[PDB]
Amino acid sequence: ITALETAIILIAFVVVASVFAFTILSAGTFSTERGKEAVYAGLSEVRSSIEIKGSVVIIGE
Amino acid sequence: ITALETAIILIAFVVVASVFAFTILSAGTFSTERGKEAVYAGLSEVRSSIEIKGSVVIIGE
């Protein structure tokens, strides 16, 4: 009796872990991708400066 | 003692396991769903932000 019972509960717990494990794998991939974007975005901003060369001239109407 | 009794008790225990297994499956699906939602919520909050560019101007009446 106890043998037939234990099989059914055993399958139930394995499936739950499988679904949970799949969710973590997909969730973890999203987090890594988002973290990578930030570093590239930050580096681009710092190097994008601009500079004035020469002298300023005004033209009289 | 006799096969006739043993069948009846055997069926009863199997059904209990089935009902318990079904609830675990449903319960596990909800919990993992909520865990996934938390990660997306956290990442969105960190990325949002605002800066101030330029001076601050006062207009006097």
From TrEMBL, chains A, B:
<feature type="transmembrane region" description="Helical">
    <location>
        <begin position="1"/>
        <end position="25"/>
    </location>
</feature>
<protein>
    <recommendedName>
        <fullName>Flagellin</fullName>
    </recommendedName>
</protein>
